[PDB]
């Protein structure tokens, strides 16, 4: 919807050379504000955004004790899951978990989710109604019946519908200059001679936030999907994103091709030409 | 804020 808050957890086991590595990151929209690394030196929930640093020590001490509990839950998960499939202790396995909430224009609850994966494939996930479970394989049905008898979905819904959207509103207000901003794309176009008859036009879009953007090529006002190349959105590194779309054009008729950039910071999409 | 310590599989 309008805004969202998401957490991402990853636990990869290192059989024979240490305990499993745990990495947790927090995101509000496309901005990372908290992180934790078991291999890091701080051994604490570390801030990654300026507006989250104003939280008191009760926050960080509580968050640090929560991520270590998340890692401790994944340690027994890695051992339990290898027994569900009769897998050896010599193989390195990965456990991933993510949850969060989506809010609307009124900053009220709109959508919630809580997903779990094992070795890169879906294991179990909470449905949209936040009341049922989607077990992937037969070994995942054991977790479902275990979590249904423990009323886990009822308590997860109290977070996704409750403190997730309430603390997302708190972060949006404290970081208004950062989270509620909208950076329009800085666009331009480059020309590259490919052959005697062909030439590629590259439509650039740099320094835009959030990452959602759409680049469309048109010829004489009609969409042209053939002979077009679109790369995935790149994080620039300074909190903004980059993306470009290209098209190969016969030499001389580059005036007929137009680039179109659709972004949140543009009420009407921009049109880019070569000349 | 984070959620409670999750249940194990």
């Amino acid at each position, epitope marked *: 919807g309008s805004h969202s808050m998401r957490y991402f957890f990853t636990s990869v086991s290192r059989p024979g050379r240490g305990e499993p590595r745990f990495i947790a990151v927090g995101y509000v929209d496309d901005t990372q504000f908290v992180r934790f690394d078991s291999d890091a030196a701080s051994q604490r929930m570390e801030p990654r955004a300026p507006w989250i640093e104003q939280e008191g020590p009760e926050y960080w001490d509580g968050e640090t004790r929560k991520v270590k509990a998340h890692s401790q839950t994944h340690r027994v998960d890695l051992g339990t899951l290898r027994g569900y499939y009769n897998q050896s202790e010599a193989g390195s396995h990965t456990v991933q978990r993510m949850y969060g909430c989506d809010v609307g224009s009124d900053w009220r609850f709109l959508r919630g989710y809580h997903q779990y994966a094992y070795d890169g494939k879906d294991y179990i996930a909470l449905k949209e109604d936040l009341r049922s479970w989607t077990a992937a394989d037969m070994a995942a049905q054991t977790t479902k019946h275990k979590w249904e008898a423990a009323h886990v979905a009822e308590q997860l819904r109290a977070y996704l519908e409750g403190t997730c959207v309430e603390w997302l509103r708190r972060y949006l207000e404290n970081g208004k200059e950062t989270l509620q901003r909208t950076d329009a794309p800085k666009t331009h176009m480059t020309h590259h001679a490919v052959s005697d008859h062909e030439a590629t036009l590259r439509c650039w879009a740099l320094s835009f936030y959030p990452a959602e953007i759409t680049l469309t090529w048109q010829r004489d006002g009609e969409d042209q999907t053939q002979d077009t190349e679109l790369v995935e959105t790149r994080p620039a590194g300074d909190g903004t994103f980059q993306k470009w779309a290209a098209v190969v054009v016969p030499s001389g008729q580059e005036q007929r091709y137009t680039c179109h950039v659709q972004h949140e910071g543009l009420p009407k999409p921009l049109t880019l030409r070569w000349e | 804020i984070l*959620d409670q310590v999750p249940f194990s599989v």
Partner: T-cell receptor
Amino acid sequence: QKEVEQNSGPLSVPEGAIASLNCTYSDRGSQSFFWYRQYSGKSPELIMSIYSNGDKEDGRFTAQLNKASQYVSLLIRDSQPSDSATYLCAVNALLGNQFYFGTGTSLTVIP
Amino acid sequence: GITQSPKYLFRKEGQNVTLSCEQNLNHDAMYWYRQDPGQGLRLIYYSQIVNDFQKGDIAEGYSVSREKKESFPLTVTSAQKNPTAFYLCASSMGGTYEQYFGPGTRLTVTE
């Protein structure tokens, strides 16, 4: 203030009537709310647990939760002599990963 | 699956007293409270993991060790000014989950 507040004064209710026990809390990332019953000289016994707004009926007592105005109540139908005890209000806190208790409210039904 | 020993204990002022609390629910968190007559619960010590413990609201004169996941021994020292209280032990799945109390220990220390 404390994190969980409730009127610790002795509350009396006629036998057979409805006993209403109120409890207020300070929002510290609170999402789970519980009611404990403790008799004179024994341990607190968990009797109720509510997680979403509204009413939750179980047996003769129902738990009422309202997160907007921070307060959670407990209504007891058909007040029996066995209900005479102090009821403790429990509220969790995702801020700090804590669990807070109230001072308790002594209930004594009158025949 | 939470037990405390002894149910009643009586010691002379000037030495240390060890209150035991064994837990069987495979909980990682365990708590120690004391309850004065007519009052509420007050946190003494608590532990999140098998080799960690943190001071509560009143930790003066109270020592606590956590060597294994199931045992949480509370040793009240002679530095405590008012050791006479109703000591309650509890455990929970996590820091934000509901706690289940043991039977309790009534400690009385006289001159």
